[PDB]
Every structure is written in C-alpha cells, then in structure tokens.
Amino acid sequence: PQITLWKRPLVTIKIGGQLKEALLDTGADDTVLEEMNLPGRWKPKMIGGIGGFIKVRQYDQILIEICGHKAIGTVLVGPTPVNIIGRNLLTQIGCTLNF
Amino acid sequence: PQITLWKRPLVTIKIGGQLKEALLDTGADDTVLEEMNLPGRWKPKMIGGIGGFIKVRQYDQILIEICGHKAIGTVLVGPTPVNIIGRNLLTQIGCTLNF
Numbered sequence: 001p002q003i004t005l006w007k008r009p010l011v012t013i014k015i016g017g018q019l020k021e022a023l024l025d026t027g028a029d030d031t032v033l034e035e036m037n038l039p040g041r042w043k044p045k046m047i048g049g050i051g052g053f054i055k056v057r058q059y060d061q062i063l064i065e066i067c068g069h070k071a072i073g074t075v076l077v078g079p080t081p082v083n084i085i086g087r088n089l090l091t092q093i094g095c096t097l098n099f
Numbered sequence: 100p101q102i103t104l105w106k107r108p109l110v111t112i113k114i115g116g117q118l119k120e121a122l123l124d125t126g127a128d129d130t131v132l133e134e135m136n137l138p139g140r141w142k143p144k145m146i147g148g149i150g151g152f153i154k155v156r157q158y159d160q161i162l163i164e165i166c167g168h169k170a171i172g173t174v175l176v177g178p179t180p181v182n183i184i185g186r187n188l189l190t191q192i193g194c195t196l197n198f
C-alpha cells in the first residue's frame with residue numbers, strides 16, 4: 001500500500017508466530033525490536049541514535065512478515081522504546097520514499 | 100523523485116541560507132539538526148530517542164528547502180549525531196512510503 005506520513009507509519013508485523021506493531025523507519029539502517037525470544041545463535045551489538053547507544057542481540061536470517069510481505073534477514077533485539085523496521089528489511093519488501 | 104533504501108537516504112537541504120546533508124527519516128516525528136548558527140528566537144525543549152534524551156533548541160516556523168520543495172515548520176538544533184528530516188517536514192514536501 002501507499003503510506004502517508006501525517007501519522008507515525010505503524011504497521012502490523014508477524015515474527016516467531018506473534019503479532020506486533022512496528023515503525024517503518026528510513027532513518028534506521030537495521031531492524032530493532034523490543035525484547036523477545038528468538039531462535040538461533042546471536043551476537044552482541046550496539047546501535048546508536050539520539051541520546052546514545054543501546055546494547056542489542058543480533059539474530060541472523062530471521063523470518064518476519066510486514067503487512068503481508070515476507071522478509072528474512074537480520075533482526076536486532078534490545079531495549080528500544082519502539083519496534084523499528086529498518087532499511088535492511090524495507091529493501092526486501094520493496095519500499096521506496098517518493099516525493 | 101523515487102528514492103530506494105539500499106543506502107542511507109541522504110539529501111541536500113537549504114536552511115538559514117546554508118546547504119547541508121540531512122537524513123530523510125520517517126521514523127522521526129520531528130526534525131533535528133546538527134549544532135549550527137541559526138538566527139531567530141528559540142525555546143528550550145527536551146526530545147527522546149533510542150538511547151535516551153537530549154536537550155535541544157526549538158526554533159519555530161523555520162523555512163527549509165529539500166530538493167527544491169519548500170517546507171516551513173519546527174526545527175530543533177541540538178547534539179544529534181546526524182541531521183534528520185522528520186515527518187513534520189516530510190509531509191510538506193509530499194513524501195510517502197510505498198511497498
């Protein structure tokens with residue numbers, strides 16, 4: 001669909017069989033989700049934004065459904081105040097910015 | 100234009116008569132700019148991000164040109180690592196997400 005930016009671009013995602021709200025965020029290089037249980041081996045990582053950094057866990061080749069579009073890629077899990085779908089998965093579902 | 104997300108969506112903006120690099124960021128409610136000399140009245144304000152909060156200077160009705168399209172709205176200046184153009188101005192240049 002076509003998403004306007006008058007409100008926050010919140011969408012429904014499906015990950016590990018659970019449904020959640022996430023923000024589609026062109027300013028995020030990677031996808032970061034509120035704390036959750038994910039399968040697989042994982043590596044530590046720090047992501048930085050306004051105000052500093054947070055320590056997160058990097059899971060690889062994770063399946064995630066974003067408004068019906070399937071994606072499989074890196075998903076970070078950590079103390080983010082908001083679920084963010086970043087450019088690594090936005091490119092997979094074919095998303096572009098247009099003005 | 101149509102902007103893909105394989106790389107960071109960096110664009111050139113014109114503000115206060117100066118040209119700068121900024122990130123188009125659908126994940127940001129507001130526009131936050133690197134520390135810079137801008138004339139006019141401003142009010143102090145606190146904004147929150149992924150790593151915590153920062154004190155910023157809130158300028159109101161500041162004119163800003165982004166790839167030729169004009170926008171006027173609130174512009175915060177503060178210790179952000181990167182210039183971010185938020186939804187407050189993205190909507191004015193008529194920007195949307197499409198997948």
Ligand SMILES: Cc1cccc(C)c1OCC(=O)N[C@@H](Cc1ccccc1)[C@@H](O)C[C@H](Cc1ccccc1)NC(=O)O[C@H]1CO[C@H]2OCC[C@H]21
Pocket residue numbers: 025026027028029030031032047048049050081082084086124125126127128129130131146147148149150179180181183185
């Ligand atoms: C996730 C990730 C992984 C790997 C690399 C990077 C850079 C990543 O992105 C991190 C990241 O913070 N990006 C941001 C942009 C950026 C990029 C580079 C360095 C600094 C900031 C942004 O786009 C997402 C952020 C999410 C959010 C945080 C707290 C509350 C609500 C939403 N919004 C944001 O702080 O907005 C500000 C401004 O306006 C206000 O509205 C709402 C919040 C206020």
